[PDB]
Paper text:
Holliday junction (HJ) is a four-way structured DNA intermediate in homologous recombination. In bacteria, the HJ-specific binding protein RuvA and the motor protein RuvB together form the RuvAB complex to catalyze HJ branch migration. During homologous recombination, the RuvB hexameric motors are attached to the RuvA-HJ core complex through the interactions with RuvA domain IIIs (RuvAD3) and thereby drive HJ branch migration and strand exchange between the two homologous DNAs (Iype et al., 1994; Iype et al., 1995; Adams and West, 1996; Wald et al., 2022). Here, we describe the cryo-Electron Microscopy (cryo-EM) structure of the RuvAB-HJ intermediate complex from P. aeruginosa.
Numbering used by the authors:
A (entry chain A): 102 to 137, 154 to 201
B (entry chain F): 1 to 135, 154 to 201
C (entry chain H): 102 to 135, 154 to 201
D (entry chain O), E (entry chain P), F (entry chain M): 22 to 140, 145 to 334
Amino acid sequence: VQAQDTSTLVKIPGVGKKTAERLLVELKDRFKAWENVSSAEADAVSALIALGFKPQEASRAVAAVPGEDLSSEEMIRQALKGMV
Amino acid sequence: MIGRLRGTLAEKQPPHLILDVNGVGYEVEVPMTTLYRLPSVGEPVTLHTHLVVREDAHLLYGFAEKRERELFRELIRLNGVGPKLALALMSGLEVDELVRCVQAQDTSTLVKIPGVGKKTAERLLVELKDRFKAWVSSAEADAVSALIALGFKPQEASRAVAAVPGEDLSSEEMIRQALKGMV
Amino acid sequence: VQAQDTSTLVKIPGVGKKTAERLLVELKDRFKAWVSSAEADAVSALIALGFKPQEASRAVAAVPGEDLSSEEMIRQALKGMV
Amino acid sequence: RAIRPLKLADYIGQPSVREQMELFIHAARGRQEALDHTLIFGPPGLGKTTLANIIAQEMGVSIKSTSGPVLERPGDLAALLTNLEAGDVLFVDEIHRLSPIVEEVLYPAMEDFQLDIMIAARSIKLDLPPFTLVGATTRAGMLTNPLRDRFGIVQRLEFYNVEDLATIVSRSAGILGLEIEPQGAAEIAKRARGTPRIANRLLRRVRDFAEVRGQGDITRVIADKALNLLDVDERGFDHLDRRLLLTMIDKFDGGPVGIDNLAAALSEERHTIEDVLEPYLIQQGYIMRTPRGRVVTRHAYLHFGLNIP
Amino acid sequence: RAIRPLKLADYIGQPSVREQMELFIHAARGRQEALDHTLIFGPPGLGKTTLANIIAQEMGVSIKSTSGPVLERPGDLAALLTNLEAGDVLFVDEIHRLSPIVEEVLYPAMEDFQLDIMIAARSIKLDLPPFTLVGATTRAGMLTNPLRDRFGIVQRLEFYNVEDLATIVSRSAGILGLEIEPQGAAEIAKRARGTPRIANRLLRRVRDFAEVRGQGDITRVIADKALNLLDVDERGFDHLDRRLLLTMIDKFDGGPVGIDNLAAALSEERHTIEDVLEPYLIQQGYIMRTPRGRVVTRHAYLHFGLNIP
Amino acid sequence: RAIRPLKLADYIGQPSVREQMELFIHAARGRQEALDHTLIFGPPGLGKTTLANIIAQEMGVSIKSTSGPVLERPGDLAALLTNLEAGDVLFVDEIHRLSPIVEEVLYPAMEDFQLDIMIAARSIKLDLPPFTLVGATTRAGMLTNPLRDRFGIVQRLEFYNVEDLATIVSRSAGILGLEIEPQGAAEIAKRARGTPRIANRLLRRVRDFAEVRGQGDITRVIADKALNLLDVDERGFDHLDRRLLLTMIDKFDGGPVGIDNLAAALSEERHTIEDVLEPYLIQQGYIMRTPRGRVVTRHAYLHFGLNIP
DNA sequence: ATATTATAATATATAATAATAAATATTTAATATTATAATA
């Protein structure tokens, strides 16, 4: 869960995908610390979706380094450097 | 039960509204967004509605749109969502913008809604992710069959066929206009 | 219900054999007062010939040979897909 | 808007062969019954589909155009047979490839238009309406001998001579409203492999040449400088033809190697290479066939002014 | 910054073919009609889309550069044709890989610019504006006979003439700024390998050689010093090719060979050999191919003084 | 000086490789010109990625070698493109083992250093700084030929001769701080089955085993003990290989027999035999399988000294 | 006259998607309280 892999959860019989993100989300919801947009940004997000990016990694990359009053090619470039 | 009301407005005490439909008023609330679309006192109004039955109470909820009723109902079917939460959400933001944010699964635009925790935001986004759908004449059927033979899906073909050209046009020109589209 | 038929009820979607058979069991006491051989032969011949099983049955059932021979209804069924 | 010859007398070439099909035409008109099943063998460019549709027009019957490469399943064959009616005809090209099951299905379908295949359970007894299956393969040697024996009409389609191809050029120019000089018609008639399709394509190229480089109709000099711009000799050479001739007179020293090797060297498909090569090169007798390969004659090697060692 | 002539006259490399297609362009311009269908085949990678774009600017109209994956569904090509207009043109690629349903849709599309489609069968007839359908494939041998016979213009693309390859080398070196020699141009033309891209790569590498070994000067001696060691030869051989030839002739003495045995013995998998080295040598014809083993021809024996069995 | 040395003088490779291309790029760098794409390939485990890292180390340009099978995704490809800047170099391992989407998002970068990105939606024009792909594949035979045409420079790797292997062993033992005699260096080179980096690994293992039984100095008795424990003699024959060849000489006396017959005789799987056992002997003159069967030299028999005419 | 094996097709183990039926799980609404960030 602290590694956030659903594959280890779903091989257990009776455990599907939806149960796996429920376990992940609702345990990361504070129990497991202890051991027991603009046109340019929308264009960028759509380009990332068309280039294999799932929307969450296309979302928090935009959120971390937003682009302001300048053209798309450079903040998408530094965002691609940003996600590394 | 209750699916829609077409009645006359009696009084406005937001958010609680009373709708006198043929002598009897109906206790219904509407969101503040719908407060920006209500008529004056005494004017008739048609509200798409859907009831909620509790153990000790019956609550009536009425919206301007049927699709708003359906989204409200699906929000209520969620295990951690009450009516107060859904009214807070839709009083913050409107319907298709929330739909696209559900496609986005972003918490920033929904945390700003008052009284909403971040944990609520991610759990609702994850359990509301897109499993739903995104929001004939002789010439019509001929075009549908022609584009089926051309490989286009019947539902995909029909929306391009029936949109731009008019009613009962020449089959060649209307097939031309249906195939005018690109993705 | 009077004829104690199950497969008629089973073909309804969402109906299991146990569900329909139970419906028989309680309805026989609840109620107190209140296509041919050539049709399947054409389908089998088209399947063995090379035709896809469901579109062949679609052609067979579009214009069945209820009042005419199996060869002629196959002849007019091959009109559909040309 | 089609140039296509819709007349029997348009294909007046091979007068004995045309008169033979005329006798068969009047026999069909006189029989008013089921014809013998037709299988014509001949190299392409001569309009075998044109011949079949002319046969249909003279019969006063509707024709469907299909081919052996098109068909893959006996169910498709049954569909094609059902779409045809009484007083119809089917044009089929390249029967040389066929599934055997299609052949035993067609055996009663051309015996008495019958179908008696297995479903066990009830077998089919479908009797087809009277319509003649017309075969238009290129070579009957590769196809099965029982089918060739069972087909009634068999004929040799050959490349057309100079006067017929010149007449076809003149009448096709008359269709387009242009005129051809008899000498230019004769030279492009003895050229273009003696085939009306290639002759018409060459006519289109030369008429475009006269549309731009010329200032009027095509004469002998217009056609000559057209072939000069087309880089075509008096025999009807192509650049690929010259290159292949040079390879098999120079690289392989007579070319006693298989057609597969030279086709792979040229990166050319086997069927296209042989269809381009064999009829015109054999009627000129430049190259024969050996099991070692398609070796040249002495005359072909002397054509380029080279003496045989 | 790709290498591309701006105009069709500026296009150099196939002067007779360039004159022929210029004649076709002026025929389209003078007649005020859409140009005929042009069939294009030859080398696989030559930037044919760019040449089609040049033809588009010569027409002044738009050409939608489309390929097999673009037109694998008949709906996409139907939509593109509906957005096509009078006097326009459509570049088509990978026609050989395309489904026969595409072929039957494109039968009436070029057949006088119509469209027939089926809907208990009902027929729906559609019309199309006149246009110039452009069919270009890596290999045209897979094109079906009625389709190719119904087409009009057929154009062949090939590697340039050796003097014309040398001129192309000179022009590209002038573009690259290399101080090249006509003797060096003929040298690289002999090294052009039938491919413009590898030719330009060789120009770049001999420019590097002249920069680092000479004083920025490309001469015949400089070109010889650059291209007479390692995987080079005046004809086009490599030391890889010489190694392959020697290892075949010392083992099997110019006899039948096992391809797996060759791959094992050369420490080199047969796949890359038959992908680059073997196809060029068989393109030169220097290896004769059998279903029992690949043997070099008499040219390689003459290269090393070897006998003929 | 490391486990793999990073100096061009510290790696005694093939003399053509030792001379040409790194000297070329050493004398060509500093011209403010982006280096073109270079390929290295050969037997596996020869440190082609390490050699590319070495080359980029003398080039003094930021470099990080990434494995292609690890990087299946074009998004990480865009990440590596944006991580580097103008005039940089990048090394890719096993390009032939990439998902194709990487390839068509990589072609315009080879064309005009352009990253065409798809999002009526329209593509966006995203230019890239000048950069270089260095290729290091085990076998890129199934890679697409236009991608080869975009690539400029390719070098092979071959079975190194005994002198180069001995020099490599000597320099790597000097790196290891060994006291091996030149006779011991030749013994280690002959015990190693060529493969200079795998030869380095084998020398490391021999050094560790000798240090287990003594000091860093290696004597011919130490080499004999290493051959005995590894069950591989100076000829490089595996113990399984030695047993199989002893059975073959004890059964058919080296006569040409079938591969299936000997596979059934030895009770071993034939495909593994083909891809493991005979390759090592067959780069050299040992095994000569024919259309009649396998033939073995008497030099292989010199291990035991029994041969037949 | 026997194999053999150098090239030519081939058929399915292993990727995938699409119902489906047994097996479950079955509560939020209102309100103090306490931090908590921001504030005269």
